[PDB]
Amino acid sequence: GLTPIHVAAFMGHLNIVLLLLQNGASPDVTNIRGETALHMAARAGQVEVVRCLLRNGALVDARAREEQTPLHIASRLGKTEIVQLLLQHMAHPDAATTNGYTPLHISAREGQVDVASVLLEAGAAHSLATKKGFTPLHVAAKYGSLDVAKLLLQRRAAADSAGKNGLTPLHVAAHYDNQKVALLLLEKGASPHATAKNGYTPLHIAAKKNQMQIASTLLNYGAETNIVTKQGVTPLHLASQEGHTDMVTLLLDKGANIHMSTKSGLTSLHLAAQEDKVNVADILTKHGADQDAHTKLGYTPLIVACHYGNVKMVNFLLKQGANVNAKTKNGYTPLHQAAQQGHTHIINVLLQHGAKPNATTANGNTALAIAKRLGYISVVDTLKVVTEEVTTTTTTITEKHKLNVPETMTEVLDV
């Protein structure tokens, strides 16, 4: 709901602004958004109008929607000369919007390095946190504002400030793949060891995203390879699950322990088995991974690969000597797991490698019986030739097929 001074100011009609003020118009009337003529002059870049309104007594820090001052607006649009004028008229450099963004946060988000330089020289606090804990350095790390991040760190902004979930700017830069900012933070002294609330380090993130240069530099600054999240996950687990062979090799080269398992018993080799990462599995095997490590429920990598139907991983694990007749704690063999999931092609490989078709689970079922109850006619037709007949009765104990699945790793970085 505009008044005449709002219109004149937005349009930059300096003659009309003076005419209105000369006749007693108040510079502080607001429109429906709570904006004054100064908000609108700033948004439109009207440097001379801004100077005239300030010199004629306008409220410098009038608050509009989201508690925005004219300084927030000028900073967002990179109106350096208007930022300077507002600060010279006592605009508070640390004024915060309702979400906690200061003009410095805004300049880091928009990559306005000239505005950030003016704010920092005028005394803006360089490390105030938003509601979620983000400092301007966190924002620069999320939006890849390298030149603003350089300025912040030159003014000794805190490189290790941690948000609500414990994320440091280095976490944020790695997560958002802003690799120059990550490398700058480390060179300027950011800790390579910082842990989020769930235990993620920057090395975990680098390992998961195959950020080879970041991982190398972290390791050069002393980062540990054998640290765990709250679920027991290591950087090597993450690299292995994703198939990042060069990352797996780098972490092993730098001391990673190939035998570490998660909370539920998953080793790196289980995760390669889950994701069919045969080249990873080869490297892990050459570094001594136990081909028959068991999860908490008793899944070996081979039974895991049978569950997910990963025949290349099945063939690879069999050639390394994995036990084709291994049993989970409730008696599932590779054959039972493949039967339950309908994987006829895996059934045929397992039978060729000596899987025992009459093996029974703890409840007494063969693989044939499990596939039969679940309607995998192709599996039944294959196992029929090689399995002893059993009669199914209504009293037959059947398996809990939804429970009889391998453990999985679902933990992720908390952003």
Author numbering: 430 to 844
Question: What does the study report here?
Answer:
Ankyrins are a widely expressed scaffold protein family, which mainly function to link great varieties of functionally related but structurally diverse integral membrane proteins to the spectrin-based cytoskeletons. Each ankyrin contains an N-terminal membrane binding domain (MBD), which is composed of 24 ANK repeats and responsible for binding to diverse membrane targets. Following the MBD is an unstructured linker region of ~130 amino acid residues, followed sequentially by a ZU5-ZU5-UPA supramodule responsible for spectrin binding (SBD), a death domain (DD), and an intrinsically disordered C-terminal tail (CT) with varying lengths. We identified three distinct autoinhibitory segments from the intrinsically disordered linker and CT regions of AnkB, and elucidated the inhibition mechanism of these segments by detailed biochemical and structural investigations.
To ensure that we do not miss any possible residues forming the AI-c binding segment, we prepared a C-terminal 12 ANK repeats of AnkB followed by a 46-residue linker (aa 430–873), which covers a small part of AI-b, and solved the crystal structure of the protein at 1.95 Å resolution. The overall structure of our AnkB C-terminal 12 repeats-linker is very similar to that of AnkR_C12 (RMSD of 1.04 Å). However, our structure contains a longer linker folded back binding to the AnkB ANK repeats. A 20-residue linker (from Thr828 to Asp847 instead of 11 residues in AnkR_C12) is clearly defined, and this 20-residue linker extends to the repeat R18. Moreover, we observed a prominently positive-charged surface in the inner groove of R16-18 right next to Asp847, and the five residues following Asp847 are highly negatively charged and conserved (847DEEGDD852). We anticipate that this stretch of negatively charged residues is part of AI-c and involved in binding to MBD (likely R16-17 based on the length of the segment). In the AI-c folded-back structure, residues from AI-c form extensive hydrogen bonds with the residues in finger loops of ANK repeats. Perturbations of these hydrogen bonding interactions (e.g. the Asn834Lys substitution in AI-c or the Asn595Ala mutation in one of the ANK repeats finger loop) led to a few fold decreases in their bindings. Hydrophobic interactions also contribute to the AI-c autoinhibition. Met839 is buried in the hydrophobic pocket formed by Leu668 and Leu701; Leu843 interacts with sidechains of Leu597, Tyr630, and Ile635.
